[PDB]
Write a protein that binds this ligand. Structure first.
Ligand code: AQL
Ligand code: AQL
Ligand code: MG
Ligand code: MG
Ligand code: ZN
Ligand code: ZN
Lengths: 325, 326
C-alpha cells in the first residue's frame, strides 16, 4: 500500500497528478509526501543542505496547520498547488530561467500559501470584525496570515529548513515568498493579469524558444502569476479532478453562507445553498477569470501550455452542457 | 487648583503653531494626549456632532495614552499629542475651509492620535533585521504602522472605550478605511512616492470660486489628509527653535539607544544611531534639505500663502542648525 503510494508519486511531473488518491494512500499527508518528493526530484535537499529529517519535521508541522475540517482550503489544496507550480516551473519556455533559490521560493510559497485557512473569505473576516482583520487592517488579511504562520513554524524545534542558507539567501527568499503569497489575494487578480499582459506584448525570447527576463521586477511578476495560475488550476485539470474541487469549494462556500445566515448577514455570492447555480458559476468563473489568465499564460509560454488550455476549454464546454435550455 | 488654572491657560493656545506641548505634558500629569485631544474635540464640537459621551472619550484617550511607552524618548505620548495638535492647526488652514467633512476631520485627528501607539523606540528596518515578532507578523511591510493601527482600533473594544459607538455603520466603515489609509502613509518608506503625488496635485491644482481647494473624489481627498498628517509628523523643524531643539534631543537619544542594541549584536549601526560617530547638527540640516523642506515647500504651495510663516520658520531653523556646524 505504501507500494501504491510510491507508484502514484511517479507522476509528480505530470499535470493531473492523482492528488486525492495520494492523500488517501499517504495517511492524509499529501503535502508532506509531495513536497518531499519534489525536493528529492529537484535535488534541493543537497543544493541547499537541508537535513532530510528537518524537511520532514517542518512539512508535517506545516500540514498539521492546515485545517482538517475545511472542505477546500486544506492540505490537499496546498499539495495540489505545490505540485502544480512544480510542473509550470519545468515548462521549456522557462527552462533554467529561475535560480535554484527562485525555484525554492515559489515551491515553498506554494506550500504555505493557504496555511491555517479558516474556510471563510477576507470579506467575511472584515465584516465580522474578526481578530484577523483587526490585526491586518483589512488588507490581504488571510494572505498576510498564511505567510506569518508559514514563516513562524520554521522556528519550531528542528523545523528550520533554511538553516544552511546564507543570511542574504534567507532575506532574498523571504522577500520573494512574501511577494508571491501576497499576490494570491484575488482582489489583486486584475492588476496581476494586466501586468502579465503587458509582459506578453513586449515579450522577448531566444527565438529558439526560451524566455528572456532581465530584471527582478518582471521575474517576480512571472512567479506571482505562476503560483496564481497554480492556485487557479482546478478547471484545467482532468474533469474528474476538477469536479471534486468544485464539490469542495461549494461545500466550503455553503458553510460560510450558513454562518452569514445564522448571523443575519447578507449572504456572499455562491454561498447560498438555497439559491445556488453551481455549474453556471463555474462557467462564469472560467469565462471571466480563469480563461483570461490561462490564455495569457499560454501566450507567455507558447505553445507549452496548449495541453493545459485545451483541457480547460474542454471542461468549460462540459460544464456548460450540464446547464439545460 | 493653581496648576489646573495654568494648564487651562496653556490649552488656550491649542489653535496655534508652537503650542508649549512639553509644558502641557508636565502640567497635565503626563497626559498631554488626553488633554489636547479632549480640548480639540470640545473646540471642534465633535462630542456633540458624533454623540461621543465625554466619559467614553476620556476613558479611551487615557487607555490610548497608556499604550505609548513612557520610557521611549521620542515616539511617546508627547509626540502623539504634538502630531494631533499640528494636524488640528493644518486642518483649519483657510485654503481648506469647508473642504473636509466632520467625518474626515474626525478621521485625521483620530489617525494622528493613534499613529505611533505602542512604538518600541526602534525602526522598521531594525525590527526586520532582528527577526522580531512584529516583522514576522506583518511580513516586513509597514511593520510599525500596521501595528499602531491594530492597537489603536483594538483599544476601542475595551470597557467604555468605543468613542465611535453612535456613528452609523457606514460612518464607522468609512472612518476605519480613511484612518488606515492615513496611518499607513506615515511609513517613511512611502515618503518619496507620497511627495511625488503631492507635487502632481499642486501642479494641476483646482480651486473653487471662493479660492478654496477643490477635491473631487476620494483619491484626492485622502491624499491631502495623508500628506497633512505626514507633514504634522515631520513638523518638528518648523516649530519655534526651543521646541525643535528638544525634539532633536529626544530623537537622538532614541536613535542612540537603538545603535547601542545594534552594536551589542555586531550589526552595522543605522544612520544617526552611533553615539560615537554622530553629527547631530549636520544630520538635521541633511534631513531638512532632503526630506522636510521638499515636503513643506510643496504643502505650502498647495495652500499658498496660508503656510508661509511655517515655511519661514523651517528655513530659519535650517539656517540656525547650519550656522552651528564646526
Ligand atoms: C466574488 O468573486 C468571485 C466570484 O463571483 C466567483 C468565484 O468563483 C470561484 C470558483 C472557484 C474557486 C474560486 O476561488 C476561490 C479563491 C481562490 C483564490 N484565492 C481566494 C479565493 C472562486 C472565486 O474566487 C470567485 C470570485 C473571486 C473573488 C474576487 C474578489 C475577484 C476555486 C476553485 C474552483 C473549483 C475553480 O471554483
Ligand atoms: C534612514 O533615512 C533617514 C535618515 O538618514 C535620516 C533621518 O533623520 C531623521 C531626523 C529626525 C526625525 C526622523 O524621523 C523619524 C521618523 C519619522 C516618521 N516616521 C518614521 C520615522 C528622521 C528620519 O526619519 C531619517 C531617516 C528615515 C527616513 C527615510 C526617508 C527613509 C524625527 C524628528 C526630527 C527631530 C526632525 O529628526
Ligand atoms: Mg489563498
Ligand atoms: Mg510612526
Ligand atoms: Zn489557494
Ligand atoms: Zn510619528
Amino acid at each position: 500500500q505504501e507500494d501504491v503510494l510510491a507508484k502514484e508519486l511517479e507522476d509528480v511531473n505530470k499535470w493531473g497528478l492523482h492528488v486525492f488518491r495520494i492523500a488517501e494512500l499517504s495517511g492524509n499527508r499529501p503535502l508532506t509526501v509531495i513536497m518531499h518528493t519534489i525536493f528529492q526530484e529537484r535535488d534541493l535537499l543537497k543544493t541547499f543542505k537541508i537535513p532530510v529529517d528537518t524537511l520532514i519535521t517542518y512539512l508535517m508541522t506545516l500540514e498539521d496547520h492546515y485545517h482538517a475540517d475545511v472542505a477546500y482550503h486544506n492540505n490537499i489544496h496546498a499539495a495540489d498547488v505545490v505540485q502544480s507550480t512544480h510542473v509550470l516551473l519545468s515548462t521549456p519556455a522557462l527552462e533554467a530561467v529561475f535560480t535554484d533559490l527562485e525555484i525554492l521560493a515559489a515551491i515553498f510559497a506554494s506550500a504555505i500559501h493557504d496555511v491555517d485557512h479558516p474556510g471563510v473569505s477576507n470579506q467575511f473576516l472584515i465584516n465580522t470584525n474578526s481578530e484577523l482583520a483587526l490585526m491586518y487592517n483589512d488588507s490581504s488579511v488571510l494572505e498576510n496570515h498564511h505567510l506569518a504562520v508559514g514563516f513562524k513554524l520554521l522556528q519550531e524545534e528542528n523545523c528550520d529548513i533554511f538553516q544552511n542558507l546564507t543570511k542574504k539567501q534567507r532575506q532574498s527568499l523571504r522577500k520573494m515568498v512574501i511577494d508571491i503569497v501576497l499576490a494570491t489575494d484575488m482582489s489583486k487578480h486584475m492588476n496581476l493579469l494586466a501586468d502579465l499582459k503587458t509582459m506578453v506584448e513586449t515579450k522577448k525570447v531566444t527565438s529558439s524558444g526560451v524566455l528572456l527576463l532581465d530584471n527582478y521586477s518582471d521575474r517576480i511578476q512571472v512567479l506571482q502569476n505562476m503560483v496564481h495560475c497554480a492556485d487557479l488550476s482546478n478547471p484545467t485539470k482532468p474533469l474528474q479532478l476538477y469536479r471534486q474541487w468544485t464539490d469542495r469549494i461549494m461545500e466550503e462556500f455553503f458553510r460560510q453562507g450558513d454562518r452569514e445566515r445564522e448571523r443575519g448577514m447578507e449572504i456572499s455570492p455562491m454561498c447560498d445553498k438555497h439559491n445556488a447555480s453551481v455549474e453556471k458559476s463555474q462557467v462564469g468563473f472560467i469565462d471571466y477569470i480563469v480563461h483570461p489568465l490561462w490564455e495569457t499564460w499560454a501566450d507567455l509560454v507558447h505553445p507549452d501550455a496548449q495541453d493545459i488550455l485545451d483541457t480547460l476549454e474542454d471542461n468549460r464546454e462540459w460544464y456548460q452542457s450540464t446547464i439545460p435550455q
